[PDB]
Ligand binder design. Structure first.
Ligand SMILES: [Zn+2]
Length: 148
């Protein structure tokens, strides 16, 4: 109904059914981008980049990882609402929720390491759309992200 599964190269996730794919490359390693055409500040991207790390935990804690992929957030200020270290089907993931700025953005990052690749899912919405229904879309897309 409101969500549709997507299968990429080595990963899958749920994308909101009303968002559309964007052909524009915003970040390096970008392989998917979906956006709300009524408010393009609501969007999501999946990045796949090579790495020498063997685990997401080689990055240090969730907050340490966040500091190393901070280009993804563009910030006068970043506030970490929550972080977690969920394990899905054997794989360690990190998940981080960050609020950046009046003007506010809620960004959720989910990440794991597999096969000499760093796989990053980032979903965001603006503060007002967040509380008006976007929170569901942002959190499902990042919660649903899994690699194989
Ligand atoms: Zn907010």
């Amino acid at each position: 109904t409101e969500f549709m599964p997507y299968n990429g190269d080595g990963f899958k996730l749920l994308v909101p059914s009303k968002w559309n794919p964007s052909k524009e490359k915003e970040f390096p390693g970008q392989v998917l981008r979906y956006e709300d055409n009524f408010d393009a500040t609501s969007n999501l991207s999946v990045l796949v980049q090579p790495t020498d790390k063997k685990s997401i935990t080689d990055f240090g804690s969730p907050e340490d990882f966040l500091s190393q992929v901070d280009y993804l957030l563009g910030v006068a200020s970043a506030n970490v609402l929550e972080s977690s270290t969920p394990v899905v089907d054997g794989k360690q993931y990190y998940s981080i929720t960050v609020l950046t700025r009046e003007g506010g953005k809620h960004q959720v990052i989910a990440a794991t390491v597999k096969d000499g690749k760093l796989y990053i899912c980032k979903a965001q919405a603006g503060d007002k759309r967040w509380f008006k229904g976007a929170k569901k879309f942002v959190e499902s897309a990042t919660s649903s992200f899994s690699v194989a």
